Design a protein around this ligand. Structure first.
Ligand SMILES: CC(=O)N[C@@H]1[C@@H](O)[C@H](O[C@@H]2O[C@H](CO)[C@@H](O)[C@H](O)[C@H]2NC(C)=O)[C@@H](CO)O[C@H]1O
Ligand SMILES: [Mn+2]
Length: 529
């Protein structure tokens, strides 16, 4: 039996939860258990790869879109996959908005069933990118979930899915094995029988295992990769294609008076920013992987084609290592040390220590925070590294109780994914939404520009919109962008072949939940002969 050992996420222990709509589920639920209608290859310019849906047609006015369901597709329990499943799934999100992870309810007014295998989504507002948005909403089995009294707490321990791996062959606190859907519609193209998911708590435990070659597919941070991982075995391979932005997010509505006086001050944010030595952070915390990001808007040099150089040039200085500039700005801004501790107090003389957040186990981020704390001390800003578990880290943000958090973002073929997910105030409310836009800075014009991006197909018009987004975010130094990272990815050729690589760059190679292309990738693998 071919078993592919994968690590899409860390856990202290394995807790059986296959609910695609809950943040507490196993990260092998979406894609593998519940296959999407379509999987957009974001690397290749967001090209749709059709799976459960055969095709789709967006109306010319961009106010609706139809999807043709592929006939002959079955749930793991033999029942047919039809339009009823899609209709029910979005209806569920309307019934329980906490399960709405994309904020899709705002855009989709209704989801009508044209026929057994055809559904039509009607929008509340024009969005040519709605097909992409729809593709990220998990679709569950209506014949099963209609009998579930409370979907919000349903752990779905014995899942019925459309995906390649639905059989829970083994489940212990330290390991679970997800095997082949006995009724998979694309069975002929699946050459991997089981997904082997061992319990790994953090980057330290992962390193020990990966160098010992007991893993096949991973996307973790690995220190000194060449010496410690690559040079240790000819089957140890990796590929780090460029990815999105990484930055420190500040909470504009921190409940502490002193902290809010600091964080909700653009001069302080710029001074915080100039204190950071971005290159040293990349060299030290990331071992030279990644590039400096001195775009106040967080755009990143990779997307320079979308940048208005003038805007970049004007705020670049506030996003460049400059100790003297940082201290001079703090002083000019009225931030001074009035109690002899070497740290600046707020203008009203209040003391504060910024608790910088980064998830426990994410050593590359943890090291970045500590480096940042030390760099901030140089400019007189008092801070301390905190490493709460991801759940806590994430919660403190949805609830706005954190101070500062270092984080990465998802990355698309253009800056929209980044700007929209990291700044649209619509994504700042609602349980079930990610952390990305939880800085609590809001602007009507910004939201308008963002929401207008896909209302037009005129690239020159979209560029004009992009420029408008750039200058609002840059002007307000909403976050403290630091760098553009990469899709960390490691593969072992000991047991399987067919992996994506620089030489076979089919798309984002990551195995993390949220990278739907992982379904396509796994379907390219085959055990060694
Ligand atoms: C865009 C995003 O939020 N991606 C998340 C990933 O960062 C995260 O993976 C973890 O990222 C850390 C920071 O680079 C790594 O140190 C850590 O090793 C890595 N973990 C694994 C298992 O690869 C994943 C998983 O938590 O979630 C994504 O949402
Ligand atoms: Mn002081």
């Amino acid at each position: 039996r071919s078993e592919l050992t994968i690590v899409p996420d860390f856990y202290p222990t394995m807790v059986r939860n296959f609910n695609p709509y809950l943040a507490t589920n196993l990260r092998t639920t979406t894609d593998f258990i519940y296959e999407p209608l379509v999987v957009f290859n974001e690397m290749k310019g967001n090209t749709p790869v059709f799976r459960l849906a055969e095709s789709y047609k967006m109306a010319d006015d961009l106010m609706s879109v139809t999807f043709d369901i592929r006939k002959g597709v079955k749930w793991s329990d033999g029942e047919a996959f039809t339009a009823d499943d899609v209709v029910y799934s979005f209806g569920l999100l309307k019934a329980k908005p906490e399960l709405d992870q994309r904020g899709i309810n705002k855009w989709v007014t209704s989801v009508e069933k044209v026929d057994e295998y055809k559904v039509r989504f009607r929008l509340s507002e024009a969005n040519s990118n709605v097909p992409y948005e729809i593709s990220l909403i998990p679709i569950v089995a209506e014949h099963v979930w209609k009998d579930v009294k409370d979907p919000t707490t349903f752990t779905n321990e014995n899942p019925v899915g459309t995906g390649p791996f639905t059989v829970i062959d083994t489940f212990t606190p330290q390991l679970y094995i997800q095997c082949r859907n006995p009724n998979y519609w694309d069975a002929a193209n699946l050459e991997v029988d089981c997904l082997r998911v061992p319990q790994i708590a953090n980057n330290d435990q992962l390193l020990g295992k990966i160098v010992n070659s007991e893993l096949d597919w991973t996307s973790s941070f690995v220190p000194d990769i060449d010496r410690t991982y690559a040079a240790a075995n000819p089957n140890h391979h990796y590929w780090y294609p460029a990815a999105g932005t990484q930055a420190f997010m500040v909470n504009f509505k921190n409940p502490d008076p002193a902290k809010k006086e600091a964080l909700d001050n653009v001069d302080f944010r710029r001074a915080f920013s100039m204190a950071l030595d971005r290159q040293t952070i990349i060299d030290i915390a990331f071992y030279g992987s990644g590039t400096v990001n001195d775009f106040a808007s967080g755009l990143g040099y990779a997307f320079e084609a979308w940048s208005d150089e003038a805007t970049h040039k004007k705020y670049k200085g506030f996003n460049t290592y400059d100790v003297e500039g940082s201290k001079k700005l703090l002083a000019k801004a009225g931030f001074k040390d009035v109690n002899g501790d070497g740290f600046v107090e707020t203008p009203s003389g209040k003391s504060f220590e910024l608790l910088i957040q980064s998830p426990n186990g994410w050593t590359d981020f943890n090291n970045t925070v500590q480096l940042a704390v030390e760099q901030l001390q140089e400019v007189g800003i008092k801070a301390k590294a905190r490493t709460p578990e991801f759940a806590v880290y994430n919660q403190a943000m949805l609830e706005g109780t954190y101070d500062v958090a270092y984080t990465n973002y998802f990355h698309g073929a253009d800056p929209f994914t980044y700007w929209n997910s990291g700044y649209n105030s619509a994504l700042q409310s609602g349980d079930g939404m990610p952390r990305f836009a939880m800085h609590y800075f809001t602007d009507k014009k910004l939201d308008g520009l963002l929401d207008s991006f896909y209302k037009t197909a005129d690239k020159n018009e979209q560029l004009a919109i992009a420029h408008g987004i750039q200058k609002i975010i840059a002007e307000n130094q909403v976050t403290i962008p630091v760098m553009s990272g990469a899709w960390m990815y490691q593969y072992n050729t000991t047991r399987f072949t067919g992996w994506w690589s620089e030489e076979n760059p089919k798309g984002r190679p990551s195995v993390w939940a949220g990278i739907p292309e992982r379904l396509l990738h796994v379907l390219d693998l085959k055990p060694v002969k």
